[PDB]
Each structure stands twice: as structure tokens, then as C-alpha cells.
Write a protein that binds this ligand. Structure first.
Ligand code: SF4
Length: 85
């Protein structure tokens, strides 16, 4: 079951960010962002990802651009940025 504080596909911010719970279904390939091949981009290795957010699970983390909510560790958004930190 997905947390109640999970980002909905129909969420304004989600639509603006072009975020999708399942990265294999995102347009990450067409976006082609620097860092690594799109085929390998997902929330899991994103700079903005935070296993800080409360209620975070193994499949669900917090996201700096999504305060108060949780994203799918296997999701993706047009804002992806290779994790260094
Ligand atoms: S910015 Fe990163 S962690 Fe947040 S939703 Fe987009 S890809 Fe996932």
C-alpha cells in the first residue's frame, strides 16, 4: 500500500515536474539529462532524494522538491540530478 502522503500523478507539482512513479514510463530517455544514461535514472540516485522524510520506507523516500510528501524510489522527474553528496 502506498503512503497517504505519496505524490499523486495528478498533483500540480508532479505534472509540472513531469514526475512518474515508475521511471520506465517517464520520458527520461527523451530528456536525456547529464550524469548517466537515462535508462539508469530514477529517484534512487538523485541528488534531491532524502531518506530523511518521516514515513519513508524501502520503496518510498522524501524529495526536496516535494516537502511533506514521499516519492517512489523507482520514480523519475524532469528534475533528476546525479547524486554526489
Ligand atoms: S527530483 Fe529526484 S528524487 Fe525528486 S522526484 Fe525528481 S527524480 Fe525523484
Amino acid at each position: 500500500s502506498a503512503p497517504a502522503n505519496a505524490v499523486a500523478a495528478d498533483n500540480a507539482t508532479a505534472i509540472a515536474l513531469k514526475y512518474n512513479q515508475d521511471a520506465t514510463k517517464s520520458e527520461r530517455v527523451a530528456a536525456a539529462r547529464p550524469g548517466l544514461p537515462p535508462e539508469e535514472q530514477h529517484c534512487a540516485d538523485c541528488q534531491f532524494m532524502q531518506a530523511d522524510a518521516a514515513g519513508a520506507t524501502d520503496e518510498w523516500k522524501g524529495c526536496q522538491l516535494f516537502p511533506g510528501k514521499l516519492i517512489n524510489v523507482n520514480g523519475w522527474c524532469a528534475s533528476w540530478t546525479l547524486k554526489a553528496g
